[PDB]
Every structure is written in C-alpha cells, then in structure tokens.
Amino acid sequence: PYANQPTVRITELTDENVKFIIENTDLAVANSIRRVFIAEVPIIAIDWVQIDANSSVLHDEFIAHRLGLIPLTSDDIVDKLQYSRDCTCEEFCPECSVEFTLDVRCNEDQTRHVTSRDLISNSPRVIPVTSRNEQDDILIVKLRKGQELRLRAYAKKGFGKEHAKWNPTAGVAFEYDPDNALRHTVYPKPEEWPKSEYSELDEDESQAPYDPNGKPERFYYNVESCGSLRPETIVLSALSGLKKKLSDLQTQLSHEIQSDV
Amino acid sequence: GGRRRTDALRFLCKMNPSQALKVRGMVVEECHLPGLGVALTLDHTKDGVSDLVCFVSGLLLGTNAKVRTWFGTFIRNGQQRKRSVLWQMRRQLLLELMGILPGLKEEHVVKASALLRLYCALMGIAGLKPTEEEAEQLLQLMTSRPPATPAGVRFVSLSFCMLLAFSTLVSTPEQEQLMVVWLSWMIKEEAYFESFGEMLLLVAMYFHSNQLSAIIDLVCSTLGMKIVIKPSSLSRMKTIFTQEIFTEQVVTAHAVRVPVTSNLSANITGFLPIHCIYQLLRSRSFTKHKVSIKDWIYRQLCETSTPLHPQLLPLIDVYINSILTPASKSNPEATNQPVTEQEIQRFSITAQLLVLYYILSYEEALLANTKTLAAMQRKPKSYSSSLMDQIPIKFLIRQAQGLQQELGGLHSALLRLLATNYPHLCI
Amino acid sequence: ALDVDATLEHVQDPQNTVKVQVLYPDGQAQMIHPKPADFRNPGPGRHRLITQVYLSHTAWTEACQVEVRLLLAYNEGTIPFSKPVKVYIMPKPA
Amino acid sequence: XXXXXWXXXXXXXXXXXXXXXXXXXXX
Amino acid sequence: DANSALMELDKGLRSGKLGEQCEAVVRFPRLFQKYPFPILINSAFLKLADVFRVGNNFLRLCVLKVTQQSEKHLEKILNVDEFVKRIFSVIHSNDPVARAITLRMLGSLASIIPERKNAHHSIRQSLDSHDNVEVEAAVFAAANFSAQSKDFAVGICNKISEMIQGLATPVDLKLKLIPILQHMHHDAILASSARQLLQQLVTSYPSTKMVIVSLHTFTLLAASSLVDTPKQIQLLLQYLKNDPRKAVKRLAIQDLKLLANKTPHTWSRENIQALCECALQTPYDSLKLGMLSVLSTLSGTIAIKHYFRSSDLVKLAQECCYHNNRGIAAHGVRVLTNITVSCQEKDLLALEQDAVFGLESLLVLCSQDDSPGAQATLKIALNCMVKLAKGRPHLSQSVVETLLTQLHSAQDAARILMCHCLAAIAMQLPVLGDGMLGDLMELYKVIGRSATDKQQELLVSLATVIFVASQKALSVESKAVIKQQLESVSNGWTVYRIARQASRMGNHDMAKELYQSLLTQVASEHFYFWLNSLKEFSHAEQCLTGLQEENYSSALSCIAESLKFYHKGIASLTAASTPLNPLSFQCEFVKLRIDLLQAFSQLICTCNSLKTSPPPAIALQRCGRISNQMKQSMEEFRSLASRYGDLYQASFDADSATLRNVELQQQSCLLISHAIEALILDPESASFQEYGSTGTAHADSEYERRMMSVYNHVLEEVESLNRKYTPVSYMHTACLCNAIIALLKVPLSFQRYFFQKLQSTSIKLALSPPIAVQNNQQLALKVEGVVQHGSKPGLFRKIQSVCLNVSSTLQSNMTNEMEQRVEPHNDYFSTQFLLNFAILGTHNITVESSVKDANGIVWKTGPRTTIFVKSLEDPYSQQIRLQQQQ
Ligand SMILES: [Zn+2]
C-alpha cells in the first residue's frame, strides 16, 4: 500500500546529455518524469521583444519568434526568478526577468550575420548558450548594407507546457523492457526487428521469453539538453517540480476535505 | 637538470654523512627533488622496522596534503619510466616484507601491520601498480596466522580491508582459493571475536543488502585514508561472500557470537552491531535459521549508558514483533532472574527502563495480537501477574521523568504505555 | 534614510558631545554630528535625539547589516556610548 | 596534592591516550 | 524536516486516546532541542497552550513538565499575549487541580511575563484558597514571580507577612511560605522590611523547623541583597552561641560557611572573635569540626589580615591541632598553615614549629588506617604542608625529612599521596631532591610484588619522585628500576607513564630504555610509530648529554648524533599523525627543536670558520665571510624566535608549564640572537641598560631554574664582553660558542601538552557566501562558526572574543584587509563581511579565526579557510566599458 523504493544508476554524464536507469519504480512514475522533462522544467527564454528598428528582409514577428527559440543559460537563476505574472512589478524587474539588448547596423559591403553574440544580457549568468566561455552562434538574421536591427528583449521564466521555447530538452529517449519480455508490443516477425541498445540477449535470440508475472521496471533514459540547463539539473528540477505539483495538490485536497467535512 | 643535482647532493651527503638526512629533511620541507630524498634514506641504512617505512609512511599519510600529493605524483611519474630510485625503494620494501614472513611472531605482527599499511598508502595515493612478485609476497603476508593478540586483530582487519580495497591483485584462481580458505579459517576462529567480527558481519550485511558504498567508507575508516576503489572491482568480491563464504545461515549464526557494544549510546556513533541485528530481525533471519537472539538482546539491553541510542527502541519493537508474529516464535525474556534479578545487581537505570519498555510493549502486543492469532496456546506465553508486582513501574517512570533529555523517545513511549495500560498510575 | 530615537540620560552637554556613528560591513565608519536643533530636552537630565541619518553604498549581493552606535566625543577622541544596534540594508542595483 | 600531576586527575582522559591505555594495559 | 516532524507529533494530539496525546505533548522538548527556530518554537508553544486549554489535568501536567524542561526556549516565541491568554483562561476553572497546574505554568513562565498584572492577581487570590494543592502552587508561583518582578514583590511581601502571622495558616504551610522572603532583594527598604518581619518571625515561632527555614531565607536575602551582611553574620553567631538545639547550631555553622565562601572580606574582627569563642566552649566535636571548617575557609582569604601576637584564633588553632578527631586536626592545621604563610610577623615563628609537628602527627595518624575518611584528611595535610613549604622556604627540609621517614612505615594507598606531596615540594626547592634519593630508591627496591591494585599507581608516583629528586642521571638505580618493572609489572601502561615522567624531568636514557621495552606491546601501528619516535627523541636528548665543557669538536659530534636520531624520530613521528587527533603540536615542537639544533650546529661551524677560512684581501667590513655568516645566523635565530612565538600562539590548549617551556625555548634563541648582535654586529648600537630585575625568581620547575640561570650567566658574559674586543674576536666566538654549550647542557623537558590533550577546542568556521560575483556588486561573506569544547571547556583558558581576519589576494595583493571582533553568545558566533572585487579574475580570499581570551591575549588558533572568487563582468557592462575605452 506504500511507496516505491526506486534506484538510480547513471551510465553516462556529459555536458549535453545524461543517460541513466531508474529501477524499482512504476511505469506511470517514469512516464510522468519524462513528461515533466519535456513540459514542466522551467527555464529562462525570451518572451517580450520591443522592435525599435528592423530594416531586414525578415519582419518583426519572424525576428521575435527566432529570438524566443534562442536558449539561455538558466542554471541557478531560474530558481531565484519569479514568474512574471506572479511578480508585483509594473514593467519587468530583475527579480522576474532578464533584459537583453541587440543593436546591429550593417555599414559594410559584406553580409552582416546577426548572431547570438549580438544578444547582450544585463545579467552575467543568463546568456545565450553558444556565447558560453568551439560551437558556432545561432544566426538570427543576415543584414546587407543599409539594414539594421535594434531591439530590446526581456527574457522571463516559463516551462514547456506553455510554449516549446521553454522546453529544456532536445531528445528524451525513453525505454523499458528492451527484450519485450512483457509482450507490451507484439512483433508479427520478431526476427527482422533490430536489437535495442539495452538488449541483454544473444544474436540467435529475437526477444525474451514471455514473463506472465512481470511488470515494467528498469526504465532507460537519455535526457539530451538544449544547453539551457545542465541535463542533471533538468532531471533534478523535474523531480522537484513533480514533487511541488503533488504537494500543492495535497494542500488543496486537504483544504477541500477540511471545508467539506 | 635533475640527475646532475641528485648525483651532486648524494656525493655531498656521502662526504658529510652526519648531516646527510638533514638534507632529506630539507627535501621534504622545500618539496623539491623527491627521488633525492628517497636515495638519501636508502643510502644510509647500513632494531625497529626501518627508517624508509617511517619516512614514506609519513610522506603519504601526513597531515600536509601538499607533500602527500607531491610524493604521489613522484611515484606515479616514476612508474612510467623504464625499469630508477623508485625500483630501489620497491626492492628494499620487498626484502623488508620477506624479513618477517614465515604464522607471524607476536612481536613482528605490528611491523607487518605497518608495512601493510604502507602498501595501502602506496597503492591508494601513489597509484603504484605492484609487480607479480610484489603481489605474490603481499598476498602471502595477507594469509598469515597471527597469535590472536589485539595486534593480530588489527593485522587481520587491515588484511581483510585490503582484500576489499584492492581486488585487482589476485587475478588467479590459486590465490583466490588461498584467500577463501584463509577467510574460512578466520571465520571459524573463535578468539577473534573479542572488533574484527563486527567488521566481518557488517560487510556481510552490506553485501547482502548490496550497498557497496559504505563498504568503501568502512575500508577508508579502517585504513585511515581515502582510496578510490571503483566498486565494479568489488563485484567479484560480493559473489564470493554472498554465494560461498558468508551465506545467510552462517551470518545469522555469526550474529549471536559477536559481542555487544558495551555501554552504547548516542555518543557511540557509526554503524554498530545493533543496527545489523535490527536489520536481520527486520528480515526475520534468526527464526528463518533457528538461531536464538534472546540472549544477545538481553545482553545488549543489560549494558547501556545514560544517553539513549536511537536504534534500541526499534530493536525492541521488532524483537517483540518477532516473538509475536505467526512466522515463528523467538523466545521471550525469561520470567525468572533475567527479569526479576534485573529489577532488584548494579544494573544501569537505562537497562531497567529499556526492560520495562520491552515488558509493557510486550503486554500491549499480546493484548492487540490475541484477537487475531489463532495459532497456539504456548505462542502468547504471557508474563505472570506476580512478576509485575516486583516491577516498580511508577518508581522507574519517576526516574525516567528526571532524565528526559538523556533519553531519545524512551521516556515518551514509557509515558504512553503507562497512560494506556495503567491509568491508575497517571492520577 | 534611517531615523533614530535616542534616550540620552544625564548628559551634561549633549549638543556638542553626543555623536552618531554608522559602521558599514566594510571598513567604513562614518561619524555623524547631529545638529543642536533636534536635541530635545523633555526633562532635567533627560534628552531626546531625533536625527535622520543617511546611508549609502554601492551594490551588495546580499543584505548584510549596518552598525549604528552613539558616541561621546571629548576635547581629542571618542568612546562608545550606547548599545550597538544592527540594521539590515539591501542596496539593490539600478 | 601536586597541581601538575599527570597520572593524577585522570578524569580528563583524551582520545589517543585512552586508546593507548586500552592497547598497552591488557598486554 | 523540522516542520515534517512537527506535523508528525502534531497529528498525535488529536488522537482522542490520552496515551498518544501525552506522547505527542512530551515529544516536544526533543523537537525544541533539534530545531531551535523562533517561528517554529512559537507555533509549537501556541498549540501546546491550546491543548493545555482544552486537555484534561494529566495533559496539563505534561504541558507543565514540557514547559519546565523548555525554559530557555520559551523566551523566543514572541506571540506572548495570546499564548499566555489561552493558558490563563483556565485559571477560572472550578477545578482546584486545574487552577494549581495553571499557577505552576505562570510560575514556570514568570521569566517571560514579569509585571503581568492578572497573573499577579491570580496568585494573590489563589494564596487565600481553601484547597491545599492550589495554595502550594500559588506559593510556588509567588516564589517565581518575586524573583522576576519587584512590583509583585512589594505587595506580596505584606501579604505573605499577614498570612504568616495569621494563625489560621497551618505550621507546615508557614514553613513552605517563609522562603518567599528570600527574593526580597530588589529594594533596600523592601529588604529592610523583610528583615524586620523575619526578626519578629524567628522569635514569634521558635520551632526548630521554623528557625531553620527563617534563618536560611534571611541569609539568602542577606547574600542576594548585599546591604544586610554584618548584622546577618552577628545574628547567626548569636544564634550559634545561644540557641541550645544542635540543628539550629548546625544551620548556623553551614550558613556562616556559605557567607564566608561568598563574602569573606565583609567579616569583621569581632565576628571572627565570636566564632572562635564559640569554638572554644563547645563540648561537641560535630559542631566544633564545622566551626573550624568555617574558620579554615576564612583563613585562606583576606579576612586574616582584617583580623590582625597570640590571639584567640591562634590559641584555638593550636588547641584543635592536637585533637583526637582527624577532621578537627586537619582544620586546625589548615588554619595554622594559612596564618603562617599569610604574614611574616615575629609572633608566628613560635607557631611555625607547632604547624610542622601537627602536620607530622597528622601524617603518623592518617597513614596506617586506609579509611576513606582518612584519605581526605591526609590530602588536606599534604596540601597544607605543600603550601607551607612553598610559602616559607627555609623550613621545607624538616617537611621533606618527615615525609621520607613516614614513607617507609605507611600503607600503600597513603604512599601515592605522599609521593605527590614530595614531588610537588621537590619541583619548587631543588636542593632537597638529591638528599632524599637513597631512601626513595630503597623504598622502590622494597616493593617487589607486595601489592596488587595500588602497586601501579605507587610505582608511577614513586618513579616520578625519583625522576624529580635526581637532577643528574642514573647509573645503577636505573638498572634496579628496570629490573623492578621487568619482574613486577607486565602492564605496559605503567612503563609508559614512568617513561613519560622520565622524559618530562629530563632523564632521557631511562625513557629511551623504557620505550625500547614498549615497542612490542602495542596493537595499532600508529602507537608503534609514536613510541618509536619517543624512543628516538629520548635517545637524541641523551646523546646531547655528552657535552662536557668548551670542546666545540665534541660539541659538533654530539649535536650531529642528536640531530640524526632526532629527525629519524620526526620521520617516525609524522607517520603516527592521524586524521583524528593529529600530532600537530608534537610535530611543530620537534621541528622547532630540530631547527634550533641545526642553527646551533651552524653557529659552531661559524665558530670554527673564524680560525678556518681567513679574512679576504681587504685593506663588519674586513672580517671576511664571517660577518655575513653571523648576519644569517642572527636572522635564522630571530626567525626561530618568531616560530616559537607562533607555536605558543597556536597552542592555546597547553598548561602553564608547556607554555612556559615554549617561552623558555623562544627566550633561548632570542638570547643567542642578542648575543650575536651585541658583540659581533654592532656593540656600539646595542648593549643598552638591559639589567633584568631578577627579584623573586618564581620558577616553577628545576628546568626553568636552569634555563634562567643559563640566561643570566650568558647575559652577564655578553655585557662584560661588550666592547672589550674588536668585532672580529676570539673571545666573542668563544663566549657565544660556550653559551651554546651552556644552553644545551640542560636536558630538554617534554611537557604535558606533548603527551596529553586537555581542553580540546577548535573553530568549525562554516562560512557561507569557485563562486562568481558581478564586478559592480560587492560580495557578502556570511561567515559563522561554532566552537567545540571537549570535556572541560575552560580548564586552562576560555574564549572571550573570536577575532576574524579576512583578506583577498588577487591572481590565485591583500587589499581587502578586514577585521571584526565578534563575541560568541551560546558557543556560536556569526558576522558578515563586505568584500569588494574591482579587478576581474580569480580572487583567492582567506579567513582567520584569532581567539582573545579573558586576559586579552591573542591566540591564532582557527582554521585558515580559503575560497576562490571569480569576478565575471556583465555583458552589457562589458560592452559599455569597451565602447567607452575604444
Ligand atoms: Zn518582477
């Protein structure tokens, strides 16, 4: 009648992904963890662009949409930042937002590439991921001579349930039962199906023998980050966020039971 | 740049041998030219153990971390060179190892312990990879038979924690079977359990629970320093104990032969035998292997000091549950002298309060269990009413009131038991 | 601005002896001379000091403290006079 | 009663000295 | 979590069952101990008050017990009004038991609600109730509130008076009701009115219980309210000499003992005279012993100087010196000894011998009986004769002689105490040591195995007094002692303690042999390395004893051999260093001894390099390389002095003796540096009026006496050879280079901090800020630390202020040099620093923790914790700065 006792084994930790295994937990818990990975981990992304000048071939909505999709370093600042709707300031403030400024003027005969280096932050720790001190820079717009782009952008806190620009993950690879011992999927011809990366069978075998008493455990993960958060920070903030949602639901349910009874 | 300076200063110390190892002292103080100091302490050895073992043990195991890292990097870089003073050090240490190996004499066992901990320090910090002859002689020194002194207990403890720490130095079935026959010889020995048996039992519990993380902490605490172990090296070590050496039956039979922690309290920290006994009673291992735990529980309860260890109350609770579960019947504390004599020679007040807590919790478990037992008439085995007259319950809770802060939750639980069971004593 | 209310008891000449010291968390120990206009005298041997002392520093990463203390000055040095009192200060960036 | 008697006033037993006593006493 | 545990024991108090509810209530003090947070203690106390208001009387009693056990935490609740109001609501209950429990709550809460007038009114109303438990609880609450509030006390004094002379009040409740007047120490007129009431009360109710309780509360009022003391003392003496009951006299005796322990300076000569007259004409030894205990307490204070020929106190001390009771004899001897060592008048010369022979008679009476009460009087007598020997030096010979004659004819358990006495005497007067060596050695010989339990303590104490008595070495006595231990004691702890005493007193060959005998007895290799290092240190200090006189070649040989053995010892000592209790002081002391011996050897090499290596071809200057050599030697010896000083400052846990030893080594190397400077480098600039005022040479040890004798001799030689020769002199090198020999001739003493760790204290220093801070912002170091007292917290010194020094060094210089003297209030301190980082890059900052004791001495003890700070720039600020620069 009680809780699981889940164990964690991490097989690969990199600045771009974490590859770990969760055992002795339920399928619903693992899937909700994956869903919070994609949708409910808060990061900082641009959500307010004031265009002052745009002579480029791309219109203002296009530039704003591209600026929103630029990932920003969000580690240990997204926890301090409040949501913009929850903060009591009139305009934006440092306690709920990060201000960005871009001002590029093309005066040369060569094409000017407006990149994420031109996005200038007012916070030293919320910067574009490609501007971290190898990889090239995210191109925003290309400018010919005479064209300019002056804008003021404000970057706030949100999660991927609202908009995919706040999704911190690139690919959340998720697996369970790699040898199909549970027969949760049924291959018409199991011989022509390639082995999983986590498969524990020989070349002569095609799938494990059927286990009638089995349940899904030993869930395999590969959480690739977009660079906005460290992948370990993605997993830790996902667990904290799911815990917080459950605790908030506990609080409201306790109030509702107390008011009804 | 280095060889010329080393030769010049070795010649200078040959010219002035009185201040020769003062230059070794300046080598250590300035953290320059480690091989020169090694050559200085090697060239002037022409009782005790030796000066070289003290010197490099002090380098690797000293308070100064800079000197430790400096000497470790020296040995690590010297390993990569083709087989030069490092090899002279290793040959001298090896011929020092054969100087005491036969078991061992009762006066050479401490020397063997010091040499063995030196090899610990080398293979832990320096990254020294021992040779085949070095590993064979070292493993021959592991399986020696000390005269079962406390020095011998320290010797076998260090040898066992090195088998745990460095499982990469066996690599052969013959040294494997020599190791396990030495382990079986140490297990069947009786005078070692007076300690080493606590360590054996605790690592057996940790492999049965598949912890393999505080195993590293126990090895580091016994050796007195931090070593990277890479627990995949201990994977073959786990299967030796789990399937062959420390089975559940022999660890359960060993759980009663280990002595109790005398005068245990919250001051005595760390993982104690009481925790392992509590873990075994949680898994009902003693009834599953027909081993009597009543004597050990009574002996542990009879020796307790004035701070209360947090594990004592859950241990008593699971012991009472083990008595009254329908899985089997652990024997309760006997109605005579081990309870009547215990509540009269000069037993501790915490012992009396713990026994009173056990008795009252046994009474509530009996009254909450007979509604659904339906097993046997001898299964309850209720205490006599004449026994409870010799128990000064109000008096004992009166002393327990005055020492509330010295008890964890014992005074609270005793108050709850008194209020539920004896409301006439709560007026 | 920080307002103080000092209950000076049995001070012979509080107009020219009682001084306010503000001590920032760094080495700054700015000493403030109150004007004689706000040394109120509600009784014999009783005095009231109501000054609006002024505090400023650049940005802090956390609200540290500030140390406010009354001092007595004499004709060449100054000595502690009142109980040391800590006030929390948070200079936020512009 | 010497004020500087080391063996006397052994109520303040240390950690190293206590272990040394336990090791060199029963031997 | 704290709030999780609070909810875990909060859910139990609506269980309905009284057992789980009292469970929930009495778990609260453990929660208060674990989580001392005011916002949480507040909520816990408010719900405890709520369950007090709604619960039954047993739950209310549990809340009362919790409140009594949590008195220090209830000052930090700060919602006082509603908490006290919901407790106070059930003062109106018709149940007298509930009213009594609430009165006990109010008395328990009286520290945080003084001047709370409804509580005062409830106590006053409940004092007149008809239920005994409610009246007793009201008395308890009145006793608590009178201590914490003077406005309660002024009216309740009149009320308690009127209900004491009210005869409807029974005698036992009167007895409980008298000690309310103890807390009348608020106003002088209040204490005067209380004293008038007590004076009427003692004569109004002359019962023995009434006079005991009234006299004790009168004296507690007189001790607390200090302007009552001479009349209280004279009242006590009057009741001691006139009231015939033994219990009243016994309270008068113990009460005058309390007043003499508290305020002995306020006793007049008439009070001491009256107490002495009481002790003369009493027929009971049980009362005379107590009176002499009071007079012996008074004798050790300045009351004797206020008292002062042959007076009644002297005659009483002489009479009680020869008494069949051992306690009366001990007290009379203590009074005689205190009078003798207090002053130097002509009259005490007669009673000096009286004190000596009374001491000897008490020794011959208290030695052969082995009673538990006899050992206390023996300790008193031996402490008294130690004080007699130290305070007055000349008569110590007879004291030592009677101890030696008593040693051969006394029981074993008495012999440890006389060995301690003889060692305490012999460390202060060294001329008495060598004359008593033969008898003590015979006593060591005649032990054999004629004991089983006190044999070990007697062996170590008697070997200790051999080592103290023998200022020189041992030739055959060492072999006889070795044979005695080998035949008798296989317990290696006795051998270790005897070797420890040998290395303490400088008998290093004996220590070397005993440490060789001990290397096979240990279990851990750590103690093996420690014992081997001790053996090598003792061997090296024994090798240093080969310096006969003036022979610099043999000096070089002996110093080289000692250095070889001694840093072989430090090679084996740092192997014994542990993560838990490292050998830090031992390693630093041995390293400093190595450096001092090496500097001595280098200086003797420069002595030889005067005559060797002749001066250069030059037509101070024109002296050759030797001028720079003594310059380097002076620099090295001054650096050694500074390092001995910083070892002194870093110890903080040593004795007075170990600190004195470190100071002696520092003075030794300072003496050598000054001897270089004053007669090689610049005799004209140096050699001022450095006449040390050698008056009372209060040197506690023989080693200290030898060191200051050597210092005085060397300083006199330097002053006598200041400008008598040219700076390139053979007499200069000879006198300095023989000063080396005189300094090294006395053996080194290893003190107690080298062996035993007492007063283990440290700073945890858990600071809270590679961390990164913006260039424009200033970093805030919220640094906090907790001290860790081990066993005795203030055995030698106590922490008064924790001086924290923090500085920042860029490019991981010292520009943020800051200092704050914070005071720990509950063995914990917290302060916050403001560090500025204008230069971008990695900033290494370090924080120190100096401790200033009660005397004002700075002890550099705390850890040097370092954290690295990176000064990263804002991208907008960086762009603005580059645009402004370009
Ligand atoms: Zn905001």
Side-chain angles (χ1 to χ4, degrees), chain E residues 192-217 219-246:
Chain E
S192 284
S193 57
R195 274 206 59 91
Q196 293 313 304
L197 163 68
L198 283 160
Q199 172 57 244
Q200 201 266 317
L201 160 67
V202 174
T203 182
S204 186
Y205 300 88
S207 163
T208 187
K209 293 186 171 61
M210 294 299 291
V211 69
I212 295 169
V213 174
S214 52
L215 280 186
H216 191 66
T217 186
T219 190
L220 288 181
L221 163 72
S224 311
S225 67
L226 61 83
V227 286
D228 283 314
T229 310
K231 50 175 77 70
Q232 175 66 27
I233 290 170
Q234 88 166 352
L235 178 72
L236 283 168
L237 290 157
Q238 152 184 0
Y239 271 74
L240 196 154
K241 91 170 305 285
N242 286 336
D243 209 285
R245 303 164 269 199
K246 269 177 78 175

Side-chain angles (χ1 to χ4, degrees), chain B residues 18 21 24-25 47-49 51 53-55 57-59 61-63 106-107 110 113-114 117 150-151 154 158 224-225 401 404-405 408-409 411-416 419-420 426-427, chain E residues 18-20 22-24 26-27 29 33 58 62 65 69 516 519-520 522-526 528-529 532 535 560 563-564 567-568 571-579 582-583 598:
Chain B
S18 67
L21 72 165
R24 167 171 67 76
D47 207 4
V49 180
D51 291 331
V53 60
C54 305
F55 173 53
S57 312
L59 294 174
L61 310 168
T63 302
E106 75 266 22
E107 92 273 4
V110 179
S113 169
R117 208 178 61 103
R154 177 65 184 183
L158 294 174
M225 65 182 179
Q401 182 64 46
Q404 173 261 330
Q405 87 283 350
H411 171 254
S412 184
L414 270 180
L415 192 50
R416 186 195 42 88
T420 302
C426 293
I427 308 181
Chain E
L18 188 153
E20 322 185 73
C22 83
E23 181 66 26
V26 76
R27 295 292 299 274
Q33 187 159 9
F58 189 63
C62 288
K65 293 279 196 44
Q69 282 151 2
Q516 288 181 355
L519 292 174
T520 75
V522 297
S524 188
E525 69 278 334
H526 275 180
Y528 176 77
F529 286 136
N532 186 63
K535 193 256 286 181
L563 272 169
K564 167 185 198 289
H567 64 279
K568 263 159 78 171
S572 66
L573 181 55
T574 187
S577 309
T578 65
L583 278 297
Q598 274 159 356

Side-chain angles (χ1 to χ4, degrees), chain B residues 162-185 187-189 191-193 195-225 227-229 231-233 235 237-328 330-331:
Chain B
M162 285 202 260
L163 296 181
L164 276 296
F166 316 117
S167 57
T168 64
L169 52 83
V170 289
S171 75
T172 59
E174 53 272 13
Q175 293 169 357
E176 269 277 343
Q177 61 94 33
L178 179 68
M179 157 187 155
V180 305
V181 73
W182 173 77
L183 279 168
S184 297
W185 176 79
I187 278 177
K188 66 96 175 179
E189 214 279 332
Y192 280 178
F193 310 141
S195 284
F196 180 51
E198 164 185 354
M199 163 184 323
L200 280 179
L201 188 153
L202 194 153
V203 302
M205 294 299 291
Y206 275 2
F207 291 167
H208 286 92
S209 50
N210 204 19
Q211 289 282 318
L212 276 77
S213 64
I215 286 281
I216 313 304
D217 291 331
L218 182 138
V219 164
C220 284
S221 167
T222 310
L223 303 182
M225 65 182 179
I227 309 167
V228 171
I229 315 288
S232 67
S233 63
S235 69
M237 185 63 72
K238 161 176 174 58
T239 69
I240 294 295
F241 292 167
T242 301
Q243 316 183 0
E244 297 180 352
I245 292 302
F246 271 103
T247 185
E248 272 279 324
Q249 190 264 330
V250 69
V251 76
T252 303
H254 191 233
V256 295
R257 306 173 295 162
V258 59
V260 303
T261 306
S262 296
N263 309 110
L264 78 164
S265 50
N267 297 350
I268 303 192
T269 183
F271 206 80
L272 289 168
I274 181 170
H275 303 77
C276 305
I277 290 291
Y278 167 74
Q279 277 311 116
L280 282 178
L281 269 179
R282 170 67 64 82
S283 88
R284 307 290 290 102
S285 312
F286 301 99
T287 43
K288 210 206 184 303
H289 307 122
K290 311 303 166 303
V291 187
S292 82
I293 203 54
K294 181 266 290 181
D295 180 37
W296 197 93
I297 289 299
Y298 180 50
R299 280 191 269 106
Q300 181 70 278
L301 284 182
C302 192
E303 268 82 1
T304 316
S305 75
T306 187
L308 185 80
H309 197 291
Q311 210 54 73
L312 277 156
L313 298 197
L315 170 74
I316 286 189
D317 283 1
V318 302
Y319 173 54
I320 280 153
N321 198 4
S322 162
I323 290 170
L324 289 197
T325 186
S328 183
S330 287
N331 263 352

